[PDB]
């Protein structure tokens, strides 16, 4: 038959929502850092196991209770209220380390205005040395300690890392990036000044060009020689790296960063304009579309990496050995540097990347504004202007350490220390709370009342012992295994692990603080206080 009715209906509407930066930039870097192919199967396994049920649970909670991530626990569990503060701290860390990629992309777009792209050659433009540009057009040999012009450009112009000898010695502040991050923060502040965006017409104009330009880039990379050598590396089973390597932590981090659960974005964006409107048929489709977009982005990235490895006549997993989040600005730059209309396509790609990053960061900073107004509506809910400006100033003051000369040493630290374990333990705590303290039977009855269809046997067993046990096992494996990294011939100092553990603790310590603080205000003995604090607050 092949009616394709599912592809016909609702797909043109769902495909416009799952467009974030966690799938075009975060997924390729994580996949290449752990090897292609051996990461897709654990990724999809962890997804199907603990990302779709949590997504559906958060959507149902936001649709039923209709409250922010700080006010949700006022009707579920008053003890576990520090989850809101943990989510706020996690979002602050995000906005502190997430805007660096946006500033780099804006600087690249600004520098990509000339007719001659700086990423093609390194003929002593500003500061170069030990260059190798002619790959195969002149048929020259490749030797050790040789770098392409793109890597030298990224390392010496947009992120001056030679000024700092490491993380222990940070240099000054580059104004060339501050002048762009200030404009980025001003544009962000001018977009959430009112906070009224539910079904605007801007989605149909900022989500149609990204997809067509991504397909153009895909067909350009496929029409490029040396592409078949990268496809085999992206589709290799490699059952050895699944057994006893520890790839589940990165997969879970990528899942919780790309989907949405963990940052309180779903409970804040879904608590309005929707109530009992065809539930159980949106979260799965959104997750499927997001996974498809992530797979397409990873396929394009690996197709470019295969050509890059075939040109260098080296291994696929040895091209970018210590390169972290710089995988995009190198492979994409080298791919655009071979297109006929290099300048125009580069400008269009950077523009769509900037717009996608803006659309992705507008939802992250919104889950905190609407959350405080639900807990303190007598002081902050009236202004709406002095609070968003204050949080913007706070996020800008905290984003000055990542703008240092050692930027690659700070972004790599807050990437798996403030987002990996923290979001994981926050999700585990909230899931076990909703499962045991609130009761799975009450949640199932509420879902049946608000939708008219009870969840299946697979969903009623996930939040009980499937996702919480998996999250606890991943947390234990992360705490028992050294998460030490390596980047640019300098792995990390000894105190880097302690600094990362302290950073990942200040966001989680809010929950025990509120647990030990709530038991003091309520009078009575220990058991009486526990019984009084377990029951939710009555209206």
């Amino acid at each position, epitope marked *: 038959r092949e009616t394709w009715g599912k592809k016909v209906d609702f797909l043109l509407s769902v495909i416009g929502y799952a467009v974030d930066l966690g799938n075009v930039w975060r997924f390729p870097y994580i996949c290449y850092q752990n090897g292609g192919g051996a990461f897709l199967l654990p990724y999809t396994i962890m997804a199907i196991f603990g990302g779709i049920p949590l997504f559906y649970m958060e959507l149902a909670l936001g649709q039923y209770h209709r409250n922010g991530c700080i006010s949700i626990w006022r009707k579920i569990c008053p003890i576990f209220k520090g989850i809101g503060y943990a989510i706020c701290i996690i979002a602050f860390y995000i906005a502190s380390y997430y805007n660096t990629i946006m500033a780099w992309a804006l600087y690249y777009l600004i520098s990509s205005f000339t007719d001659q792209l700086p990423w093609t*050659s*390194c*003929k*002593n433009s*500003w*500061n*170069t*040395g*030990n*260059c190798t540009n*002619y790959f195969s057009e002149d048929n020259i040999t490749w030797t050790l300690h040789s770098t392409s012009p793109a890597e030298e450009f990224y390392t*010496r112009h947009v992120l*001056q890392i*030679h*000024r700092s000898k490491g993380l222990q010695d940070l240099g000054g502040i580059s104004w060339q990036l501050a002048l762009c991050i200030m404009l980025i923060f001003t544009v962000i502040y001018f977009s959430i000044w009112k906070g009224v965006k539910t079904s605007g017409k801007v989605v149909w104009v900022t989500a149609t060009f990204p997809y067509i330009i991504l397909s153009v880039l895909l067909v350009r990379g496929a029409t490029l020689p040396g592409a078949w050598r990268g496809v085999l590396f992206y589709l290799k089973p490699n059952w050895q790296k699944l057994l006893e390597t520890g790839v589940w932590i990165d997969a879970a981090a990528q899942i919780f960063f790309s989907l949405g659960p963990g940052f309180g974005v779903l409970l804040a964006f879904a608590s309005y304009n929707k109530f009992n409107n065809n539930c159980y048929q949106d979260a799965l489709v959104t997750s499927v579309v997001n996974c498809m977009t992530s797979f397409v982005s990873g396929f394009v990235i690996f197709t470019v990496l295969g050509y890059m490895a075939e040109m260098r006549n080296e291994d696929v997993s040895e091209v970018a050995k210590d390169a972290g989040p710089s995988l995009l600005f190198i492979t994409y730059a080298e791919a655009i540097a071979n297109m006929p209309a290099s300048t125009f396509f580069a400008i269009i790609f950077f523009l769509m990347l900037i717009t996608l990053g803006l659309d992705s960061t507008f939802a992250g900073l919104e889950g905190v504004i609407t959350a405080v107004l639900d807990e303190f509506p007598h002081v902050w809910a009236k202004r709406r202007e002095r609070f968003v400006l204050a949080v913007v100033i706070t996020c800008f003051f905290g984003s000055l350490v990542t703008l240092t000369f050692g930027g690659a040493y700070v972004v790599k630290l807050l990437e798996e220390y403030a987002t990996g374990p923290a979001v994981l333990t926050v999700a585990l705590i909230e899931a076990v709370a909703v499962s045991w303290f609130y009761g799975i039977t009450q949640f199932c009855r509420d879902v049946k009342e608000m939708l008219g269809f009870s969840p299946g046997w697979f969903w009623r067993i996930c939040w009980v012992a499937i996702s919480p046990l998996f999250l606890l096992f991943i947390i234990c494996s992360f705490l028992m295994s050294p998460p030490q990294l390596r980047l640019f011939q300098y792995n990390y100092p000894y105190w880097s692990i302690i600094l990362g553990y302290c950073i990942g603790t200040s966001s989680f310590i809010c929950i025990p603080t509120y647990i030990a603080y709530r038991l003091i205000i309520t009078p009575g003995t220990f058991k009486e206080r526990i019984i009084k604090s377990i029951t939710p607050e009555t209206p």
Partner: antibody
Amino acid sequence: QVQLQQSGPELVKLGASVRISCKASGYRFSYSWMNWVKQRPGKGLEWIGRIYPGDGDTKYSGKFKGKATLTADKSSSTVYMQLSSLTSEDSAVYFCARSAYGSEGFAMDYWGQGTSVT
Amino acid sequence: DIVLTQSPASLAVSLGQRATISCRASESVDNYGISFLNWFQQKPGQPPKLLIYAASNQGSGVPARFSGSGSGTYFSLNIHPMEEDDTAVYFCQQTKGVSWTFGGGTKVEI
């Protein structure tokens, strides 16, 4: 070692044109710039322009933008320079200095013997 | 172009004396930590020879007599062990952008 030679002496004729070559050897030719300076008898040095082998860029100082024509040739690695509208003032010595390999951008001390025209 | 002038005009050659040559770079700034400025030396009748590059590093085949110092606008040269062989003309060229120009040159002769 990196050898660098030039042509021999010439004659500056009113209204004619000359051609000075610079054959470099001993390193990567199309990887570093090729400076061209002018030194009048008694006076100091005077920069003319630069040319990167490989059809990449073509720059000048500002006073010889119409009287100097830097031509490269990757076949024999001999950089040329064709002057136009000569006079009694252009009677000087033209050298050929190879630039550095990037960041520093200094002269690698591989200067020619000098093409003293008269 | 970046105007670069030298304040000294002519020094005196003396055994065991310090020589100071400075270049005016009022319109100049450091780009990536290395000062885009070089020091040359041209003997009478001989082609110019590289002496000190980047104003901090020593060139090729140059003794430890010449030592550069300074960053940003002002620069200096240390010619403390000056013998009768160091009688030449030293120039000053900057390599910031497309502004490559030489200086006036200071000849040393007693």
